[PDB]
Amino acid sequence: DGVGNASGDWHCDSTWMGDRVVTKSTRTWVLPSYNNHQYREIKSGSVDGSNANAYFGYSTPWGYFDFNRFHSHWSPRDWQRLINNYWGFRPRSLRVKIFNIQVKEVTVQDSTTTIANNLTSTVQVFTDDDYQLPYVVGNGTEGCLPAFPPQVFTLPQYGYATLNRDNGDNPTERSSFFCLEYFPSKMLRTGNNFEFTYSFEEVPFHCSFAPSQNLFKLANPLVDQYLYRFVSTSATGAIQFQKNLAGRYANTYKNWFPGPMGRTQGWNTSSGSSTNRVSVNNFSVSNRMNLEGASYQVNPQPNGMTNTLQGSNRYALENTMIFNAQNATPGTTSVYPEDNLLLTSESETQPVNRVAYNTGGQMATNAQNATTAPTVGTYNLQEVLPGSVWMERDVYLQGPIWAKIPETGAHFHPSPAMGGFGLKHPPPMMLIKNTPVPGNITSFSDVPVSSFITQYSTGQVTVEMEWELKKENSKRWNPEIQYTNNYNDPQFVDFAPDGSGEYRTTRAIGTRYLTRPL
Amino acid sequence: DGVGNASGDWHCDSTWMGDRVVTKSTRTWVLPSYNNHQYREIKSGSVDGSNANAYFGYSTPWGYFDFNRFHSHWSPRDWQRLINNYWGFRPRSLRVKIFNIQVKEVTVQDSTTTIANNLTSTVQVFTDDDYQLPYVVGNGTEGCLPAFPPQVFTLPQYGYATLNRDNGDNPTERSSFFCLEYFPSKMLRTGNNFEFTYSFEEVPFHCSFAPSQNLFKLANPLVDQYLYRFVSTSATGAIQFQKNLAGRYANTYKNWFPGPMGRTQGWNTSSGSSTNRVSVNNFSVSNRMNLEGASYQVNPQPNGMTNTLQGSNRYALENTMIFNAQNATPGTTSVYPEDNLLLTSESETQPVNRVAYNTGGQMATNAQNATTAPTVGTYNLQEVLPGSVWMERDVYLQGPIWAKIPETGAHFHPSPAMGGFGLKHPPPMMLIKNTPVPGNITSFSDVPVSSFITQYSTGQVTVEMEWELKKENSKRWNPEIQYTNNYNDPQFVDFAPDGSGEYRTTRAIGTRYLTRPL
Amino acid sequence: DGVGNASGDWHCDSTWMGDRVVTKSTRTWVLPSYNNHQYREIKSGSVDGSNANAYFGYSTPWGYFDFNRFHSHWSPRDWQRLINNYWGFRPRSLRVKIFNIQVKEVTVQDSTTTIANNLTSTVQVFTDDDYQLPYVVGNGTEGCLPAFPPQVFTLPQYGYATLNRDNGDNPTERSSFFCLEYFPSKMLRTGNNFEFTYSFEEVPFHCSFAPSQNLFKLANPLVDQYLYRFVSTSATGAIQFQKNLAGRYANTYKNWFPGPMGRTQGWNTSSGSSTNRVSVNNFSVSNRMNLEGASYQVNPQPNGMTNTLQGSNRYALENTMIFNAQNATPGTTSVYPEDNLLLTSESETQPVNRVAYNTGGQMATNAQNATTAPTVGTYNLQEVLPGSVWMERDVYLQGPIWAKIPETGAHFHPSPAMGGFGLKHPPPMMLIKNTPVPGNITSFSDVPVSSFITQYSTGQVTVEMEWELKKENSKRWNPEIQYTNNYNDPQFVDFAPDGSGEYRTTRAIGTRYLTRPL
């Protein structure tokens, strides 16, 4: 529209209206000119002695907007209002708007770097509505809209891995190259803006409640069962039985079973670090799955287990989501102690989910005879069974919202391991790049020009999300557990900027506070 | 309405009308004043050396109506008419009515206990329509409407277990107390009655047929497959093949597989008791699952297996439903032989379901080389796989009808292990209690009165259920197996009262008699 | 209506609908025949050496329904939902219903006490709509509807004090006798019920929030004031000034002042009991007001002060509401330690209200000269001043809801000291009594009969209250403090019945959790 007219306003807000809540976030972004306007074939061989690290892909000159983290939409107080009062929620719609674009020309001379705006430069933007591009958004990576509204952020560079040959850095006949310029995109000069809208598919509500009953103790503790159980064999081999008494939950017949489990090693946090094995390199003794001839770690394991047992300091670390308390630099290889990190605990699900670091149980391992005694053996892993129930991983304020279900034609219970909503058609990738501007070209050449004017753009982005809420409807008499701002002798305010302006966050806030009977 | 006017009639009947059958049952109940009108915190530590027996809960002064057993609705003859003629059935609706209430005042003086009616006393009744209370009805417990119509029964006392801490008798911050008086209930004096109606959710038909074909022998025995199989390696290592011939079912390619299995120990009934290991305590060598740090027995195991192999006397007792031939007293710890009990056999499902006490099969356990021979190892347990089929547990005349699916947000194939229909919203809990009547209180006190007049109530209850039937539609030429009243030299009539008036039942009647090809 | 027909149902519930919440409570009561149907002149002289204890009054044969406590209407969980999510609330309407009346005849013979119902006996009920009777309901006395729904309670006996002469037990010419039979009342036999409705007058919302700013630090800490202050006098007597700098809150000019205060003694709870004066009898050294020649203690003092200073263990006990953790017997004179009681803390109001046990400040006490130095003196009490602000006492789950404003024709800020809503026309007194039934009178006499049949009645009472809520509307970013069910190593569930059936309550729950800037 115009150089001296704003193409949009600043909208950050939450509006609660019954069973709906609309969140609005606006952030300032900055887009670098990645790769110098070129596509590059990126590849890697075996790194750290693991050929599962090998890949073949492409880095593109495009950047992308990632809105896949709860804190990009929810302030800590609104999150508290959500988890203390509702049984569940789910995304309904999304509206994105990119505006107030500013393209800057950078010029370095002799020890001098000036910056001036280029009023005629454009920025290109498109959304991948048909999912024709490798969707890299739901894999727990950096670059999402920052939690704290005033924080300015750089858009991450779009890249992808395709097929590599024999766990090496070579491509195969099936490796695919995708050209992002081969999509129709809108071009924006300083007065133009871009708007996009999207609606989520019917997805089940995330469960924001913990069970107030144990799965194996659902029977009335005052009445016996009209069922009998084999208890022994007489001195002559006659089978003997007894009635299952009231309250003896170790013996009652069960109708339902706990979800699938796969044993993972348990480690003690600090209080119990003296009981941990010393100097052990976890990779060699970790849970791994094989695929195409290589072994990959599979944290945080499939859903169905609890990583800790409420009241203990032992964690099944590979079944745990681990966040940094602060934003880290790219490529850091420092070894962090637990004092800098935020460990998540899924102990609220222990009345239903089995403990990840213990054996799942025991089964018969032979045929009993008058000469051979009955034998049992414990099992470390057990997959899904008919009539089994479990609770999915909880969502966190600083964790992912959705994940795209891989299109293969066959899947089971499409719920991403890192938590969130599994979607067949998630919010489309929104790509953006600075349109190239050639330097001073005087003569002709059939070779593509390589000399460009260095630029970078900036602007604002606003994301509006409507969420549907599930009202709590309990008849519990006594008070419930609530997430509360409880600190003893605070030296600073959590979820607030400190003296240096840095946003501080000392806790990973889950969703499970309210209870429900089974 | 009035003291001298009946508030309802006696309806016991079955009406067959095409693909529908309506059952009506009326019984006389008696409600004691449980706990003396108080709520009590009930708890237990480790019992019988098992901390899975520990619990923390509440016993309430309420009683409840349980209609969750087939014989509370079906006479033995109607059950026979059902299982000999239909392929399946399922619940459609339910109507309950409580009437002809009589409250009796009990007064004991010096070695004298008189009983008079209290015309002004009430009884309180409510149904938990929103499932806000711990549903204790579908866990195979006593207290259901008796099988024989003239039998008067006592309503069981409502109680529940909530969360306990570290497998002990202490509560946790999440333990929930539910006050039943915090629900709106109808109050009834002698002339009043209470009626309730409910409709079942679309649930799949229970299958009342046995397969007349084996899962691995579905191929035409007269034609070969156009498929070849690896049979060996030559003296030089060349792989060799052969065509899969007609009728050689051990070698045909299969399209479908048997359901999941988990080996359980097998024991011989009497005929073969001399081949059983002697003096063995089953608990230590039983199939158990771990949950929250404790091990629980999980009878009757998940669906997918047959507990016996038709033609043998060996049973996988932990995969078996065991009923008493008669009603037992509360808390009995006698050790019963198999002569007093009714063992159920699921052998009709053996053409499809794997045998619970045998190994499930064998798989490769290494990589074959010119130096290492191919090795295989048997597996005792195997969970669900794509393209697998199995048959659910059969229902019995003396067994449960439904079970409530635990609300967790994630489950697989919600079919209760004890058989029946898995429901998200089952018939609501119907609670009832005698309204308290204070004794002679003369002075004031801020402390709740503890002195009450002792009462108990009685009345009639009628339950009407509509069932939907699936007609048999077979082209089998020869006669089918039918359940029949066949006894040799009967000393009494089964399913009839004996000389002392006691109702006798010598057999557990299943549902699988008709056959169907796969 | 009828002997065998219930005249009402049981309604206990809470229904939240936007800015309104309707609470319903039903309880069972028992009414003794107080005084044996007679009015008695009750009086007392000086008790415990205090003639403020003298009184002259009347005890009547009537009982009354008291609904003036929050826990008679709010379950602990609904209270938590209220205080964690709203900024305020206020009563809108009330509906009361008394039904299912049962009159019992008591007859004691030789060491035998039988109880039978008297179907023709009545109970009398009336409400004092015009406030013509001494309103004894809002003075923190026992007898209200019990907190726990299943608890049966005795109605307290209605009595009142009128004028006594010279602090003695004699009446004056102005002492008034009120005959309750001189009001029209409804008579109820077993089939009848009584209903009453009432609407509250526009009353201001109770404030359920704590200030997140201090009253004396409202100025921007980054900007100075354009005001100067007198700081000293030169060596020649010239007055000198300085500008009030940014953030120096000790010197900024203020626009508002803290509410009124009246120093009360401070005492240390247990942690600091070694610093308390030993063996001191509080009455002689307590805060007292004189009236009609006698001195009365005036706990909990007028509004405007905080009784504790967050972070300390010292309490201004006379400015504190003290509840028992359990119901106590009538007339107990035991000396309780703080381990049995629930002390309330108003520290949330300290940013605005002055500390009750410290001096209020200091003022000039002379006229400065070249010979006399300026002198200041501290003041222990200070009443209301123009431009002063304070916060009223908080309400508790176990405290009073309203108080009747004394009709005198002149009052200031009608807010009861014990907290709650001050009303000119509060819910009317609801009186009830057992109609007298003469014994066997054979001959005539002009003297009123004294021989009566001993009876007592019982029934149910339901109270429905509509409350209006004030939605929280904050822009605070970081999480707020919330009331939470947090206990470490619980041996029992708080706000739940224990093993003996007794309802336990270990905490007084206030209303101030959310914050607001000033």
Author numbering:
A (entry chain A), B (entry chain A), C (entry chain A): 209 to 726
How did the manuscript describe this experimental structure?
AAV’s human cell entry receptor (AAVR) contains polycystic kidney disease (PKD) domains bound by AAV. Seeking understanding of the spectrum of interactions, goat AAVGo.1 is investigated, because its host is the species most distant from human with reciprocal cross-species cell susceptibility. The AAV5 clade also includes AAVGo.1 (18, 19), which was isolated from deceased neonatal domesticated goat ileum.
Displacements of ~1 Å are observed between PKD1 backbone carbons, and the shift appears to be a rotation around Arg353 that remains essentially unmoved. The complex of AAVGo.1 bound to PKD12 differed in modest ways at the VR-VII and VR-IX interfaces. In AAVGo.1, however, these residues are replaced by Ser442 and Ala443, and interactions with PKD1 Lys399 are absent. Therefore, AAV5 VR-IV has unique contacts with the PKD1 C terminus absent in the AAVGo.1-PKD1 complex. The AAV5 VR-VII residue Gln532 makes contact with PKD1 (Ile349), and the Ile349 interaction is absent in AAVGo.1. The lysine can be modeled within the density for Arg353 in the map of the AAVGo.1-PKD12 receptor complex, suggesting that goat AAVR might be only minimally different and that Lys353 might have interactions similar to what we observe with human PKD1 Arg353 in the AAVGo.1 binding pocket. At first approximation, the binding of AAVGo.1 to AAVR is similar to that of AAV5, so the one exception becomes a second structural class in terms of the mode of binding.
